[PDB]
Amino acid sequence: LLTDLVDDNYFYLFDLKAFFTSKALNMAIPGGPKFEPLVRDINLQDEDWNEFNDINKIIIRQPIRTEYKIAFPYLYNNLPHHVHLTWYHTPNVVFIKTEDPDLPAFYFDPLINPISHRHSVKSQEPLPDDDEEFELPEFVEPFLKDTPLYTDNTANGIALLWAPRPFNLRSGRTRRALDIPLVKNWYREHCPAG
Amino acid sequence: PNNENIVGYNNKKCWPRDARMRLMKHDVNLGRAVFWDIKNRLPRSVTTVQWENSFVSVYSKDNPNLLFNMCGFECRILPKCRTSYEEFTHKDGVWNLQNEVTKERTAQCFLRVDDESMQRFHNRVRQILMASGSTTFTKIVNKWNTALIGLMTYFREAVVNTQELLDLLVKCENKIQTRIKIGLNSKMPSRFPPV
Amino acid sequence: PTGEVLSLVGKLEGTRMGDKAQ
Amino acid sequence: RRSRHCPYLDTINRSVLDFDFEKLCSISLSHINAYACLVCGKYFQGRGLKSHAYIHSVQFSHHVFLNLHTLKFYCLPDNYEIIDSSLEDITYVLKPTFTKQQIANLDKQAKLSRAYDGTTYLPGIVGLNNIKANDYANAVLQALSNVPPLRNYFLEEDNYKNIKRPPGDIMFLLVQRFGELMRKLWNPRNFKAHVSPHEMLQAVVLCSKKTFQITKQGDGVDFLSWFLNALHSALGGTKKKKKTIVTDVFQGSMRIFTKKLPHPDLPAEEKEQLLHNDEYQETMVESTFMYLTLDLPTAPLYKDEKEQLIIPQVPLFNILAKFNGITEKEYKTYKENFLKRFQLTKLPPYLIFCIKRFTKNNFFVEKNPTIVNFPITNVDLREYLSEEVQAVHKNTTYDLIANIVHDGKPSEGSYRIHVLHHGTGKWYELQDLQVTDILPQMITLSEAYIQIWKRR
Amino acid sequence: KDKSKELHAIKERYLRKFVF
Amino acid sequence: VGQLTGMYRYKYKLMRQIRMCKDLKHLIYYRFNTGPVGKGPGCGFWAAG
Amino acid sequence: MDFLADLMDNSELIRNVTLCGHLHHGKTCFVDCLIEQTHPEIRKRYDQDLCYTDILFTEQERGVGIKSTPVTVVLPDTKGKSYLFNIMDTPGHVNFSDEVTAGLRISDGVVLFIDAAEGVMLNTERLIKHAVQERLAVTVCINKIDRLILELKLPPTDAYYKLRHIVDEVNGLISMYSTDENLILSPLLGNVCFSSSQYSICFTLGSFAKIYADTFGDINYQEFAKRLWGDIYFNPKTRKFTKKAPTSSSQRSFVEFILEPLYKILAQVVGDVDTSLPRTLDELGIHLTKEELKLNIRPLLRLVCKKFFGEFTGFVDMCVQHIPSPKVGAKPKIEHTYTGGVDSDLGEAMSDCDPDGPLMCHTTKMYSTDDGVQFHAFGRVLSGTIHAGQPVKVLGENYTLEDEEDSQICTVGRLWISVARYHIEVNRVPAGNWVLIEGVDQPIVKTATITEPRGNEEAQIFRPLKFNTTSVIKIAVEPVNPSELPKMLDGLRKVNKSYPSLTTKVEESGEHVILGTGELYLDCVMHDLRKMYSEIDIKVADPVVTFCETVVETSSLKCFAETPNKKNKITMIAEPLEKGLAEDIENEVVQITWNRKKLGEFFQTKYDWDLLAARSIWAFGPDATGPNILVDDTLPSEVDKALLGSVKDSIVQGFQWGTREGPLCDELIRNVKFKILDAVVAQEPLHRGGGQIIPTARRVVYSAFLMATPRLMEPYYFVEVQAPADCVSAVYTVLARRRGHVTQDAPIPGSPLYTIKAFIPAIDSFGFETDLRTHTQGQAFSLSVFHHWQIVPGDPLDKSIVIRPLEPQPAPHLAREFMIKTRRRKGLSEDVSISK
RNA sequence: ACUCUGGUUUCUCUUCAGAUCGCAUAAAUCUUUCGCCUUUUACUAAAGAUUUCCGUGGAGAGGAACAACUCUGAGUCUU
Ligand SMILES: O=P(O)(O)O[C@H]1[C@@H](OP(=O)(O)O)[C@@H](OP(=O)(O)O)[C@@H](OP(=O)(O)O)[C@@H](OP(=O)(O)O)[C@H]1OP(=O)(O)O
Numbered sequence A: 001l002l003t004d005l006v007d008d009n010y011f012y013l014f015d016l017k018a019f020f021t022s023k024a025l026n027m028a029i030p031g032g033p034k035f036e037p038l039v040r041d042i043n044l045q046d047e048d049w050n051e052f053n054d055i056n057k058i059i060i061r062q063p064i065r066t067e068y069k070i071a072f073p074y075l076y077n078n079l080p081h082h083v084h085l086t087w088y089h090t091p092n093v094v095f096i097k098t099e100d101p102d103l104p105a106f107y108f109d110p111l112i113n114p115i116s117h118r119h120s121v122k123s124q125e126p127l128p129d130d131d132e133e134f135e136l137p138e139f140v141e142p143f144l145k146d147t148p149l150y151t152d153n154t155a156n157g158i159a160l161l162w163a164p165r166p167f168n169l170r171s172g173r174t175r176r177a178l179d180i181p182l183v184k185n186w187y188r189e190h191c192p193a194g
Numbered sequence B: 001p002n003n004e005n006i007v008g009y010n011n012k013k014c015w016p017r018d019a020r021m022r023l024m025k026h027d028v029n030l031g032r033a034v035f036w037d038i039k040n041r042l043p044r045s046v047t048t049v050q051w052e053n054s055f056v057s058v059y060s061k062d063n064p065n066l067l068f069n070m071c072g073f074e075c076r077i078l079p080k081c082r083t084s085y086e087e088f089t090h091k092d093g094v095w096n097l098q099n100e101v102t103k104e105r106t107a108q109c110f111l112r113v114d115d116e117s118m119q120r121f122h123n124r125v126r127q128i129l130m131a132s133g134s135t136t137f138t139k140i141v142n143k144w145n146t147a148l149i150g151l152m153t154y155f156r157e158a159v160v161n162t163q164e165l166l167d168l169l170v171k172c173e174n175k176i177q178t179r180i181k182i183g184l185n186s187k188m189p190s191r192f193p194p195v
Numbered sequence C: 001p002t003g004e005v006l007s008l009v010g011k012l013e014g015t016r017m018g019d020k021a022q
Numbered sequence D: 001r002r003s004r005h006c007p008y009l010d011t012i013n014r015s016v017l018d019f020d021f022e023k024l025c026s027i028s029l030s031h032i033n034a035y036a037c038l039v040c041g042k043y044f045q046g047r048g049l050k051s052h053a054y055i056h057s058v059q060f061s062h063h064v065f066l067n068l069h070t071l072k073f074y075c076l077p078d079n080y081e082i083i084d085s086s087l088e089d090i091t092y093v094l095k096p097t098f099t100k101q102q103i104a105n106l107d108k109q110a111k112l113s114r115a116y117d118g119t120t121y122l123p124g125i126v127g128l129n130n131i132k133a134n135d136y137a138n139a140v141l142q143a144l145s146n147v148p149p150l151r152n153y154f155l156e157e158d159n160y161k162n163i164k165r166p167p168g169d170i171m172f173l174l175v176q177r178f179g180e181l182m183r184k185l186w187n188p189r190n191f192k193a194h195v196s197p198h199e200m201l202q203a204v205v206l207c208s209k210k211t212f213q214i215t216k217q218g219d220g221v222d223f224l225s226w227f228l229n230a231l232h233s234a235l236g237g238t239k240k241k242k243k244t245i246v247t248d249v250f251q252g253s254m255r256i257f258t259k260k261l262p263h264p265d266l267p268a269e270e271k272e273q274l275l276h277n278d279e280y281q282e283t284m285v286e287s288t289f290m291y292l293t294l295d296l297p298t299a300p301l302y303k304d305e306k307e308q309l310i311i312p313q314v315p316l317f318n319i320l321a322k323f324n325g326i327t328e329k330e331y332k333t334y335k336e337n338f339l340k341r342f343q344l345t346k347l348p349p350y351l352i353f354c355i356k357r358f359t360k361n362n363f364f365v366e367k368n369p370t371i372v373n374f375p376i377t378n379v380d381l382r383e384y385l386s387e388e389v390q391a392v393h394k395n396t397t398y399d400l401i402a403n404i405v406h407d408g409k410p411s412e413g414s415y416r417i418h419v420l421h422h423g424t425g426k427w428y429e430l431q432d433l434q435v436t437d438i439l440p441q442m443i444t445l446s447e448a449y450i451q452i453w454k455r456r
Numbered sequence E: 001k002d003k004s005k006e007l008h009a010i011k012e013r014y015l016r017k018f019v020f
Numbered sequence F: 001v002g003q004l005t006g007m008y009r010y011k012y013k014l015m016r017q018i019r020m021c022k023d024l025k026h027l028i029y030y031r032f033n034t035g036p037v038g039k040g041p042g043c044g045f046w047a048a049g
Numbered sequence G: 001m002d003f004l005a006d007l008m009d010n011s012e013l014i015r016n017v018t019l020c021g022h023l024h025h026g027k028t029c030f031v032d033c034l035i036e037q038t039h040p041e042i043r044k045r046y047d048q049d050l051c052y053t054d055i056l057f058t059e060q061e062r063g064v065g066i067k068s069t070p071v072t073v074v075l076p077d078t079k080g081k082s083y084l085f086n087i088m089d090t091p092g093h094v095n096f097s098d099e100v101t102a103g104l105r106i107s108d109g110v111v112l113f114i115d116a117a118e119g120v121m122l123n124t125e126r127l128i129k130h131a132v133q134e135r136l137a138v139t140v141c142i143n144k145i146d147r148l149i150l151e152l153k154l155p156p157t158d159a160y161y162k163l164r165h166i167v168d169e170v171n172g173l174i175s176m177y178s179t180d181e182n183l184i185l186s187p188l189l190g191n192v193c194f195s196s197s198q199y200s201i202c203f204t205l206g207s208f209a210k211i212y213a214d215t216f217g218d219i220n221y222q223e224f225a226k227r228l229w230g231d232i233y234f235n236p237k238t239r240k241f242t243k244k245a246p247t248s249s250s251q252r253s254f255v256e257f258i259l260e261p262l263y264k265i266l267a268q269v270v271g272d273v274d275t276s277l278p279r280t281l282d283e284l285g286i287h288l289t290k291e292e293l294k295l296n297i298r299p300l301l302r303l304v305c306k307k308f309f310g311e312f313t314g315f316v317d318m319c320v321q322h323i324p325s326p327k328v329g330a331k332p333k334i335e336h337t338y339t340g341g342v343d344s345d346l347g348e349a350m351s352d353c354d355p356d357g358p359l360m361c362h363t364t365k366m367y368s369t370d371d372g373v374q375f376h377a378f379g380r381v382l383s384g385t386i387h388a389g390q391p392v393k394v395l396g397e398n399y400t401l402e403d404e405e406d407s408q409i410c411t412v413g414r415l416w417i418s419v420a421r422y423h424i425e426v427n428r429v430p431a432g433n434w435v436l437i438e439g440v441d442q443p444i445v446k447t448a449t450i451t452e453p454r455g456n457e458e459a460q461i462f463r464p465l466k467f468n469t470t471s472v473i474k475i476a477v478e479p480v481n482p483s484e485l486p487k488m489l490d491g492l493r494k495v496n497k498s499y500p501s502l503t504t505k506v507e508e509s510g511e512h513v514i515l516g517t518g519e520l521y522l523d524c525v526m527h528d529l530r531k532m533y534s535e536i537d538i539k540v541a542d543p544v545v546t547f548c549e550t551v552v553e554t555s556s557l558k559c560f561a562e563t564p565n566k567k568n569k570i571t572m573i574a575e576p577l578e579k580g581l582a583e584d585i586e587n588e589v590v591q592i593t594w595n596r597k598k599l600g601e602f603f604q605t606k607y608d609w610d611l612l613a614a615r616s617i618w619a620f621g622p623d624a625t626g627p628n629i630l631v632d633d634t635l636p637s638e639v640d641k642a643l644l645g646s647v648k649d650s651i652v653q654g655f656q657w658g659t660r661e662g663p664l665c666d667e668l669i670r671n672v673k674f675k676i677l678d679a680v681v682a683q684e685p686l687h688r689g690g691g692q693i694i695p696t697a698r699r700v701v702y703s704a705f706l707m708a709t710p711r712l713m714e715p716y717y718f719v720e721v722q723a724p725a726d727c728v729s730a731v732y733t734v735l736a737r738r739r740g741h742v743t744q745d746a747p748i749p750g751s752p753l754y755t756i757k758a759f760i761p762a763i764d765s766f767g768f769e770t771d772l773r774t775h776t777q778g779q780a781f782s783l784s785v786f787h788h789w790q791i792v793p794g795d796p797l798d799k800s801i802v803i804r805p806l807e808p809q810p811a812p813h814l815a816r817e818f819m820i821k822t823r824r825r826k827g828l829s830e831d832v833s834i835s836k
Numbered sequence H: 001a002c003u004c005u006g007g008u009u010u011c012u013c014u015u016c017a018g019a020u021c022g023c024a025u026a027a028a029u030c031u032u033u034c035g036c037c038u039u040u041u042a043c044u045a046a047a048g049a050u051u052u053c054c055g056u057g058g059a060g061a062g063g064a065a066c067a068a069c070u071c072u073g074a075g076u077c078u079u
Helices: A016-024 A066-071 A153-161 B025-041 B115-130 B137-152 B163-184 D052-060 D088-094 D100-104 D135-144 D172-185 D198-207 D220-234 D268-276 D316-320 E002-014 F014-032 G002-009 G027-038 G057-062 G094-104 G122-133 G147-151 G156-177 G205-216 G221-225 G253-270 G277-282 G297-309 G313-320 G326-337 G345-350 G482-497 G519-534 G596-605 G641-656 G690-707 G725-737 G768-773 G811-826
Strands: B066-069 B073-077 B094-096 B108-113 D035-037 D064-067 D073-075 D080-082 D252-260 D287-289 D292-294 D313-315 D338-344 D352-355 D358-360 D365-367 D371-373 D402-405 D416-420 D427-430 D450-452 G014-018 G070-076 G082-088 G109-115 G137-143 G192-196 G201-203 G360-368 G375-381 G391-394 G408-411 G415-419 G422-425 G433-437 G448-451 G473-479 G505-507 G511-516 G538-540 G548-551 G560-562 G569-575 G629-632 G673-680 G710-721 G741-747 G754-761 G782-791
Touching: A016 A066, A066 G768, A153 G253, A153 G297, B115 B137, B115 B163, B137 B163, D035 D052, D052 G690, D135 D198, D135 D220, D135 D402, D135 D416, D135 D450, D172 D198, D172 D220, D220 D352, D220 D450, D313 D316, D316 D371, G002 G070, G002 G082, G014 G094, G014 G313, G027 G070, G027 G082, G027 G137, G057 G519, G070 G313, G070 G415, G070 G433, G082 G313, G082 G433, G094 G122, G094 G360, G094 G519, G094 G782, G109 G122, G109 G156, G109 G313, G122 G137, G122 G156, G122 G782, G137 G156, G137 G313, G147 G156, G147 G253, G156 G253, G192 G313, G201 G205, G201 G297, G201 G313, G205 G221, G205 G253, G205 G297, G205 G313, G253 G277, G253 G297, G326 G345, G360 G433, G375 G448, G473 G482, G473 G519, G482 G511, G482 G519, G511 G519, G519 G538, G560 G690, G569 G690, G629 G641, G641 G673, G641 G690, G710 G811, G725 G741, G725 G754, G725 G768, G768 G782
Parallel strands: D292 D352, D313 D371, G014 G082, G014 G109, G109 G137, G137 G192, G629 G673
Antiparallel strands: B066 B073, B073 B108, B094 B108, D035 D064, D064 D073, D073 D080, D252 D287, D252 D338, D352 D450, D358 D365, D402 D416, D402 D450, D416 D427, G070 G082, G192 G201, G360 G375, G360 G448, G375 G433, G391 G408, G391 G448, G415 G422, G415 G433, G473 G511, G473 G538, G505 G511, G548 G710, G560 G569, G569 G673, G710 G754, G710 G782, G741 G754
């Protein structure tokens, strides 16, 4: 019952703010719903052929699609009343959920392009030699030596960060049986695949 | 200083925006100039020529259409020479013109029924329907037919090209039928024969 | 089938005014 | 230095310079170094190589320009200063230098001034251009003009700069633009016999926000009520100036005795006890007025039995009879009525009479087209003051100066102005550019809306 | 057929019964 | 509900809910009848509607 | 609170920094963490990022910073010394490069931000170059370290490998831009910081050594701060750091003593939060109550990392000792910024930043109020002292010593130093600091040299704000009702003031034109123009691109031009320049201020130009950095040099303006060489005036250009996209649809995301930022910036080409379609005539 | 490591609600704008403004249950 979406960049023009924009513009995202116009403005639809919007002065290379006028509702269109903005391109979280039941939690799985460390050019930095004016106390150590680098509940905990809204809470209030839309995140998806 | 001569420029909004006369700067200035020249001739006390109740249509290098409602017939004259290709006859409300000196199809007059005539006919049907307290069905339908052929024999070819007029005609005929059916019985029937 | 009048908008593809009236 | 002489002096066109537009660059939208071409009359960004003014000079071959800040002329294509004896006249148009003697020798002036276009006129009697629904603005500006106490404070630029302007002061532009416009219209020598308030309505709409928008015809009374208040408030920064140049001219002290709860819902005994309670009686409500309001009798609403559709003519003294202890008006509001009687205790040097023509009914706003018969050069107001104050004033006689007449419905109006040229007696009618010396009877025949007086 | 459709779209832009 | 109970004939607005539920069905079914499930009356995901 | 002013008075404990970085790299969150460190009452929400410096609403809704925000804050150091920090967190979007430059002129330090999982990106590639060109100390802070652990789950060794790969790539890339060889960045040296803004993690090697010293004790954190980064290791038996491996499965010191503890602590606070969390907080001295342990994972992680590391001392000591103070950095800033340099009296007066010396503060921003009426200028007081109510003199950008008319004497109304949302009113601001001056908005557009009246007689102005990109996209603006046109003029002026590279312009056809960098930039500027300044309705034309005019071959005939008097006669030839010569002009490689010998050797060696002309080159295209060139090539026997030198100025004046306009249409002329083959000047200075030569100059330039085969040059945006490998084809298909072509597709090391670098025509790139994300369902993302200009396919001057109204034309028609509509947009004639 | 520290759960009453009261979402009435328009009762589908409905948070008060097992900050935090 849970889509495996980590970020919301998949909801680029299917956010509810974009739908508010589409409603206030009497325009429809191809996957989005249709609405009655906020204001009829039929006369304003029938704007005359001026020297501003003259065709012969306009260069058409790629048509100005509806989603263009929705992404930038103050540039590609006129009269943007009761319009909302959304460009929340959150840095697309690069999360690789584990599939191996047996694996180090911090593993360099092949889904990551190798760093390919090199030493061709002698790009040296200030470095010491052996037994060069320094000595470490016997007491001092890395902070956490006894505790393991990763426990068994480390992969599950990390994979739980990017869980959907209900499953990223350690604790929370109780909701009614009525108020839990199980398939809410289904029609909110971009489209049905064919 | 503000190019403010276009804010109140009347235009035939029914036609498509390409067919509608285009408001270029030079053309709007010329139209307002010509109207002012005409208006200044007549004394303001003898009579007056109001701009808002007037229409000026200009044909120039920028506008290929000449628009005017002569006697209720909104006509758009479009020369063949300027902007035309493969002229036809499949539309019945499009007058072919003729250059009498040369006998060649050189223009094209698109006909249409203006908003005033459509509104007048709709109001006539309305006042037929509301004036039916005791009038017989035959009287109502006789008034309806008389009103219908009052304009249809008048507006003949324009009715074909005025889709909204056709919709209004069908709507008003359905209103007449509904009035008669309600006159028969209160509860409207599911079907009702045309016979 | 119903007695309601259908608008002949879009019904004029193959007809003329002077046809069937000579 | 070839600066002084120029081979392009004659190319200047004096009838094309219309200095009533916004002094901002046309090409690149800037106010800095606003330089104006004299050949054709366009605005530019300033001097310098490859500059907009320089580009225009080397493109149109227009050589001699004008600086709107230093008021020093230049030849941009070679970019050197220009000095000429005749050219000085142009500098007198945009910035008229009214030295104190010209103010002192202007109420005694009876010579018609000369305009470059030939359109003769008298200073002060100048048509304000109606760009867009500026009839009310032109009317109030002209009526505020011809006020010598206000006339002698704005013809010199060195009168209102010294005032303190707080950091948040955003209304001094109103005062300075009013002064500059007044200098433009009071100019004895200008190219055009008219003047455009284009630079003034912008300050009006900036200070008053979208209110009094030039799109729709504004209300005269609602206008000057805010206008005089704004002039009073602008003069003085972070310092209570109860008396400024406009306060000691139009403002007058006024006494009001107000009784409340005369409502008929109260029985006779309860109202008798209420007035016996000593809580609801005439009260000390002395305050100030910027202008006296005049309330007219309602329209007859019926044809006269003998002469149908008789024009309602009411003497002015009947209206002014409101301002005495004899009469009291019931300004009923909300639940309980308020019976107020008015009184005058300090006559201002100039008395303003606003007239309540336009009023809203229960459903729709109408106008009260009641004509008033009012004199123009002899009126006595001594009966409207208490004797313990009447002794102070030895001058209670007022002479009309400006009159406002409105046309038609509120939504379709066209203001007209009757101005008196002091020194002479020529009453001139100005609507947009109209000039006509009317007789002292057409002032009485028309229905007045705003009147300006002078106690002498 | 994409070209004709997109040009047509450009021209568009710049110019009782209980049924369940 | 509309087929089983004729309540929509007594309040028209109910059609919304009616259509709403049917739409929900379609949403769940196309997600239910996937792969080797096939088509049939074997869905009991009633909490959606 | 008054200690703020006391430290304000000093000029050596002050730092001027910019946290410049790529789009969405945590800069705003970093400043938010600093605010949360300083102000206790300001607490960030559990889930929603507070975004303290994002003060305007449009960036609060779009989620992207748009305008730089000043932050004045007192930060303790590692040793506990307070420092006053001026922070200019520039917007990260490459289309918002305006504010990066606007905040970089008034700052001495550059603190870079790089996403740990993203590496070096497009933006940073230009900020390192820009900061080096502006002569600022550059420091890197790899932000979002958490991504290498909580998202990538890399092994700690591979985490160090990623960190060193992104650290040395900065060093490797910057070696092209930086001439000096002291600019090598490395965390052991102290240039590089590591931080996760969301979880408040921040450290330099010195700071972490301070933590260990704090815990164990008797540790010198400097020596141990060294010997941490590198390939050296730690021997648990000999307690010495060795280059060689002490064991077979050895581990680098940094990973062993820094990255591994971070891994363990954050894994313990995200895994086994209920069993082994108290054990790992007892071992670290972090004591927490019951109620602060019942929060969610993200707030708990942030709280625990705040408790463990503590205050942001690592960033502070990273900044203090690696960027110069204003008293130290003033000399390079002045010699690169002041027009006269340090040599002039005022120039030498700046090398010491005397608080009591001459005041010539420099303002480079306009932060409007909440009503939008008045504009509060923002600037750095490079020297002198300013006071409230002081009568000051504001200069301009065209103000010189000869042109004393471009200035105004104003009154500084109030003074306050601003930290994001709230401002602190101060009566006096000393030198070397920042300030919002009030009441100086009227005589300024963009930059200004606000100086003393009648006290700085020979003082010049600061150099114009040079940018990295170019304003390319062009949109028309009109009011809906022309009856309120003046309401829109002031709004256009206001947006021109509040946007450094915005270029308003009125053209002959009465058209208002706004120039911008990208789609989002124009969206923001028009939102400001509508809902903020003008509060009226505005019609916008669909975006169009400015073009350029060039040549490819010499003219068939030596077309000339004569004055109307038929006395002077100038003959000129237009020919293309050498490939790459145009770039070597716009990059300030050669100037007109050069002496003749140096330019002659330059053109003799690099461009093998003959010395007979190499010492006869007058001007460099329009303005000073113009890519065109004027060449004197008349033989001395036919053209008298003494007679030539009189019109030597006027010809350039008609040329520097001749190439600006362009004969085909009102567009720049680029990559053209003008050879003069014959000059017949009037023997007397009477009839050879500028009013006759300059029209003749422009006419001969236009005639040579037209007779030479002309071409249009369209600007190509350089687009990088980052998408997972499954969407690389989804980028190829989109870019092939808009005449684009891909240059590279390099996977980012240490991350599955790729980086596809391509070129796309700017006129063909409208909506591509949305045409890509929607096609890839939001996984891909693109950024665009102008790169170069290319000859538009086809001949712009062919009459057989027919322009259909509303459908795209093929490539050969483009050069004809683009200009003609442009000409129609310019209001000019339909075609071009030889008379022009 | 000495101290005092001292409950949570449950059922009600009374108010205040800023906030996604609610990570959910209905109905009614009224005023406009359409659609239909044949009259109510249903509608139409958007806007605005209301009300009831299913719920909620906080604070206080009053009982009951673990009211007495605890427990927490404070402290001089006593080899
Ligand atoms: O018309 P729908 O509502 O979509 O449903 C009908 C059908 O019966 P109903 O018309 O009475 O629903 C079944 O739907 P259910 O009876 O199962 O609700 C069937 O579904 P199964 O194949 O799962 O039995 C199938 O619905 P769908 O197309 O959603 O699978 C079918 O639809 P059509 O008759 O429209 O093809």
